[PDB]
Amino acid sequence: HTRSESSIENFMGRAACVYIAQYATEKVNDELDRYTNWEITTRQVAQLRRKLEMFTYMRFDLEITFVITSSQRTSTTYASDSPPLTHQVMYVPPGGPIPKSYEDFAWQTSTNPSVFWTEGNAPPRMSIPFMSVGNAYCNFYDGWSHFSQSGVYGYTTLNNMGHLYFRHVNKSTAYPVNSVARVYFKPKHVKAWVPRAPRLCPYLKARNVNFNVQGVTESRNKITLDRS
Amino acid sequence: HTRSESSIENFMGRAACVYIAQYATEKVNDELDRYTNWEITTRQVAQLRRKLEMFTYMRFDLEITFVITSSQRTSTTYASDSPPLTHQVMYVPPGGPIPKSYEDFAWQTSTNPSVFWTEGNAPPRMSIPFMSVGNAYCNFYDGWSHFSQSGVYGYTTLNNMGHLYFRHVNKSTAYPVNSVARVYFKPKHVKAWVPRAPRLCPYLKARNVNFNVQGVTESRNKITLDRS
Amino acid sequence: INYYKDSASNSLNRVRSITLGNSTITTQECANVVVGYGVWPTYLSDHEATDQPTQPDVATCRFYTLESVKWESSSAGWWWKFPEALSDMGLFGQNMQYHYLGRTGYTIHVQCNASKFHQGCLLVVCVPEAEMGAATTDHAFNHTKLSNIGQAMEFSAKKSTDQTGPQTAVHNAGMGVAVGNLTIFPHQWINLRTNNSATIVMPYINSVPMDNMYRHYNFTLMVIPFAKLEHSPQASTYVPITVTVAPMCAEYNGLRLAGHQ
Amino acid sequence: INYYKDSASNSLNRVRSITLGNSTITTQECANVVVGYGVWPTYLSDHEATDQPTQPDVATCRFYTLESVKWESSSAGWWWKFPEALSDMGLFGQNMQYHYLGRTGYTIHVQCNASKFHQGCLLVVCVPEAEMGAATTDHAFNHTKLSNIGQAMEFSAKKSTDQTGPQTAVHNAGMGVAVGNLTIFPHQWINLRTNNSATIVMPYINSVPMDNMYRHYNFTLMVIPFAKLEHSPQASTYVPITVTVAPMCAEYNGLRLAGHQ
Amino acid sequence: VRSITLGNSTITTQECANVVVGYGVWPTYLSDHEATDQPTQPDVATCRFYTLESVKWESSSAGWWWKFPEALSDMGLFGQNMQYHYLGRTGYTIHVQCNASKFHQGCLLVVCVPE
Amino acid sequence: NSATIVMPYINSVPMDNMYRHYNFTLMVIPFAKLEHSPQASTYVPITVTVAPMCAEYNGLRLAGHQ
Amino acid sequence: GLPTMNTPGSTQFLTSDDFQSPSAMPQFDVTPEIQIPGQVRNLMEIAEVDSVVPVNNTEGHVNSMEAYRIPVRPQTSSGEQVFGFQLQPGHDSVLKHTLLGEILNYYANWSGSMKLTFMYCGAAMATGKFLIAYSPPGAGVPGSRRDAMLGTHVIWDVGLQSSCVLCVPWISQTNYRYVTSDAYTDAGYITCWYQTSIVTPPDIPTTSTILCFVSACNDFSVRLLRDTPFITQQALFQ
Amino acid sequence: GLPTMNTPGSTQFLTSDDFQSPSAMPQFDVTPEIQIPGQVRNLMEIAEVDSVVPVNNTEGHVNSMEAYRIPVRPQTSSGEQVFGFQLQPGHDSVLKHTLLGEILNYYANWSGSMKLTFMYCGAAMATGKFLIAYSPPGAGVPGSRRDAMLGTHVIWDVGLQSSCVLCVPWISQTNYRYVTSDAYTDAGYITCWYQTSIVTPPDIPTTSTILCFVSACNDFSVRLLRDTPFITQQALFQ
Amino acid sequence: GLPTMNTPGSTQFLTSDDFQSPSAMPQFDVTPEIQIPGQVRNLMEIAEVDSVVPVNNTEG
């Protein structure tokens, strides 16, 4: 009975979705934006969050895979012949310059790690090492950002990993096409510390530990069993 | 604290865009030309230029990757069925014969290194060694081309690497399609000499060190801080 | 066989007296002393750096006594946040204002006695990084409602409706968990049948070697009754609970003017 | 494991007297002599080739004195371009016209004295390959406005509007950088409080072993005051700065008729 | 020229001129023969150079005086340890500094009178 | 231009309460008065920089000093 | 070059794959690991730790602290039941939300001996004996103390010791049991019975409290990792 | 042939990848490398070199040489401030455009001791003492010499030496601080205070100049290479 | 099989590439090489040989 599936690296070492980015080819709405950004966080999906927040301190190494799938926008005609779409994901480090719009020259970088992908190939994956200014990743920070105990209470000040910027490399399509990129995180080389109680109440936001009140366990009829 | 990201080879050894070539399938305008040329220079993008011009003398080896993406021209109809486009990049050495037009026989070479690429595959990369008649690449040349101190003042006389010629191998498409090839340079085996001050004023052209006047640092209110 | 040169690119690895300075505590019948996560609070090593770390050994590592709290029948529980409850405590708190960073371990000694004719059970637990949620959601709370200067913040039996306070429902521990699962944190049960006290020695638990001891509560001490205090009405009524904390191997750095703005 | 046979296809590698000929300088109180980028100017080795290199040792390596310049209150700074400021200098410049290629090191000795009641600070720096920008953009400048024959070209405090000159704004150094960042180039600060002189020995810095010494200024010597010269009005007013350069291990090749057309 | 470091503090200028040490005795800690619990010695956080308020030297200046350990009363963590403790014991290193040009004149007497 | 005196602990007892007994005083007395030319600088300041050396304490109680 | 041949299973994304990947930030200097107390190398070392069981979960007791308090009191006829729950860790709504059950719910199999620790939080002058039995599944659940004495039991006297330990053994017909239990692999029944009574002197309150704790022994093991059926979100948490 | 299987991450272009590639000009004879003075093997050896700090950047002083000149003069009340700036290398608009800050702006992390060299460019007959303090972040910025003497300071007499060195140590709660600074990792405050005065003989100008230089010590280090947020171009430079 | 990963630069035709290729006529018996005078191993050995220069190239 080797406890192989109960180790930390078998528990956390599995790909799980963390963000679903949506971007189009035509800026029909402000929301698609023709490109999309995402500050890196692991508090937006409940299933990876409850795995992460059983421990106060983590030291996980990371692997990031994207599953980009495209689909045509609903118009009156759809007959066209287009070359295959090329996607670009540019990891912007914290504090670096961001693209202000499409057709900017921040996408033609010189130090930002970027990746390209044509539709039909294997899903592109990249690895990101331990990105911290300390000795662990703090899943819970019980304090404030300012020295006068004001501003921001929570783990948000210590979660500073950067941005992911998604765009289409192709300039134009003859009919607009919406792309959906699903970011998948796979922890590796994971070292954990200070085990925490598992979360009972379902989450409410992404930047705090706020909750609504719940009972500890769903109820039963009596306290005793009765049958022959 | 191993200074690993502060070495020269980690600093310069990253792909960065240096030129964005544009060419079409139909010569709608003189500019597309149905093909396009580019004399090799690294003074057209600011981000690689400021990395290069911290040193007076470089000896970098080179790797050149292209990201060619195509997109249909705006017409009234778009329904077609075309075989995949094949692109050709022919590196012409300095002094060699150039193609005068499309359908020329200079594209069917015998010594010029060329590469072919069908859309949908991996981006094509090639390597170019240290291309110089001297012992270093001079980022700054403080002198003239002629012995009588006339003609050309600057680094342009010592920047002689050749041309890149982009074209479509396919003869005709049933509707015109514009291709955008983004050249990416990745230095390697880099040896630097004589460190220069980092550039303050933003650049103005590509063949000189001309600038407009700027202040050394954006200003503040007072010279002293005042709070308890 | 590894293909790359970076480790991000690899694959997975598949009776008894306790004296501190001029202070002593009693009664301990050689019953139980819980030490942290198996770690005794020691001084920092030389591998973690960084000038000269200041260690006022005898004049600081001593037993400070807080204000006592009343254990009634309808008491949900209380909590203190350290190093904020030892803020105005002797020369421990004078060294906090004059220094930038700090580091300390503890030995919390909670004491609550009663007769042989009483009953009730306490849970004395030490939760590190007890990030509390909001009572009113989408509205951040003030720091004074989390922890005052050495003042015992109490829980509640029902949900709160405070706009700028923490959620003080005691069966959810103020955090978002079940309160019955709080035994993984270092703790000791006070049973009025057989214990009458609890002593836990806590080491320094953080992700950094040192930390500014104003804008980060390193851990909290929750005292939650699980079995409520019932006694005969002709017995004694006032049953007080007293918390006696002492720092252990306190270090500081970054000597400047007195804080903490 | 390498797959290819060409190295382009690999992966990344992840009081005191100084005598030169019949010339000596004074005063030097054994203060400071800066030598280049750590390299003393020597003759060329046999690995760099290419007939017989001509080395007129004693008749050329000597201290030439340029024209003195006035240090006023509103002086922005000056610059000289070598080997163009030693053009009409003895037998150094006669060997430049008769030869195709040349190679030389230097020892620039800038000297500027004042009383104990003066103040002001100079920066004597040696910038190699100081490619200057245009004053009026998209209009190339003449070579006479860059460097005349041994004549001190001066900076300006404001921007220029010359159509065929360099941009002489002194806080941008005429190059496109901040003038405060000029300390990476080999230099020495003249402080009128404690220095009164500056001596820098410069080696041959180029990307080729030899070079034609007419169409390429190998380096420039900028003298920029950072603290302006202030004195009492009853003191002495004329404070001159004098530049004394000597070549070191000068070599030549390519003997033909006298240039330089 | 000569630097004297105490904690995170240094003084200048001293041209290796003169340092007077007491009545020939350097201030050390107390021995075990004099008693009396545990003596508290905050070495680095207290033994540091505190700077007082400057005083104007005019023509008609008679002189000034300070009384120690009363002039270091509100001085950092030296004075916080004075209130919380009954007894104390300390040595000193007083560094009085007053500069002028070559065209000035005048002579000061910096003396340390006990009791 | 300066003066530096290192003073030991001088008392008749090994320790002493540092509120009700000034252990020593520092007198700064000019013997030759400061004369300068009227066109020179006028404000000549004197600055006292004291550091304790090997400070010890005993008798830890509540904060004094009544 | 080397002639290759693509086997089926290429160019896919198995989400539980173990493959290398090119790094985004190469030659990155990671800050050094240090000593932090309480390093967990395995999820079973969390399930070793006890946690008090909400046995009294009869609504509305689950919204307060009273769900953890089992009420005992003097009786008029000995041999009656105090509590009793089906031994379905991860599925029975008594100890599914405990520290053992919330770890078990991330899996689909479990195998090992469980340990129940009880603690009498009564008066110091109060005494009495309890029979804490465990009956293997069979047929069926016992309905009396005379019936639930024929299996595995301990007789806990609260005068001698305040804490008892009932180590529930692994008596099964398989190697593993499912977390989401069914009729195939039942695990049995835990009950508690008044052995004699609760005998107090006067001036003592008539109602007391027993807490019950659950943990896992050294032979506990899990298998077949899955998603937990507790948290349900619809959109991304903003 | 050899049966292969494409893992995810194939046929992509990671811009920081390290892969071999076929050469365009094979068997090419490279001209030999020679001795050129001043070979730089590391960007930190540039940040070792001092560079004078534009402390007096109060507009319109930044368009002239006066931004590098800190004006000192005789005083009427001792103990006043000369200059003071927040220690944000790469972010504070005093030394961000220096040689250390322009190298730091290509990164997102920094860790090491900084060294400040000051130089009094006054008359040779002029003297005086300065207090150059450094207060760790804490709370807050000091507002007097009596407040900014309780941290780390040096007392520089300009009669003895014309240059002083204030080595700002690394006293932080992390391993690294960000270049684009925030409230999480402050680095402290540099100030300068008049210790006594500036005492000159007659026939000396009443205003002098101190220059301030910044560099990096041997424990300086950087991390997380990125793009610099200074240069912004729109189209290709022609 | 063996998990591979396509790097950029695959499925292209660099015209100065050096790659092996399957033969069209396998096991082919080549006729033997013999002694022929004047084997040239290098183009510089041709440039060693003198050739008379048309110096008087003034039309016609």
Residue numbers in the entry:
A (entry chain A), B (entry chain A): 57 to 284
C (entry chain B), D (entry chain B): 30 to 43, 82 to 117, 120 to 330
E (entry chain B): 82 to 117, 120 to 198
F (entry chain B): 265 to 330
G (entry chain C), H (entry chain C): 1 to 238
I (entry chain C): 1 to 60
Direct quotes from the study:
The genus Enterovirus within the Picornaviridae, a family of non-enveloped viruses with a positive single-stranded RNA genome, is comprised of more than 100 serotypes. Human enteroviruses (EV) are presently classified into four groups, Enterovirus A-D (EV-A, B, C, and D), among which EV-B, the largest group, consists of over 60 serotypes, including all 6 serotypes of coxsackievirus B (CVB1-6), coxsackievirus A9 (CVA9), over 30 serotypes of echoviruses and more than 20 newly identified enteroviruses. Most of the uncoating receptors bind to the “canyon” sites of the viral particle, dislodging the “pocket factor” in VP1 and subsequently triggering conformational changes of the intact particle to release the genome, albeit that SCARB2 binds EV71 outside the canyon.
We separated out two distinct types of particles by ultracentrifugation and characterized them using SDS-PAGE, single-stranded RNA detection and analytical ultracentrifugation as either 143S F-particles, containing RNA and a full complement of proteins VP1–VP4, or 80S E-particles containing VP0, VP1, and VP3. Apart from some disorder on the inside of the E-particle, the structures of full and empty particles are mostly very similar, with the external surface expected to be antigenically indistinguishable. Superposition of the asymmetric units (protomers) verifies the similarity in capsid structures of the F- and E-particles (RMSD = 0.4 Å in Cα atoms). Like most enteroviruses, E30 F-particle possesses the hydrophobic pocket in VP1 harboring a pocket factor, whereas both E- and A-particles lack hydrophobic pocket and harbor no pocket factor.
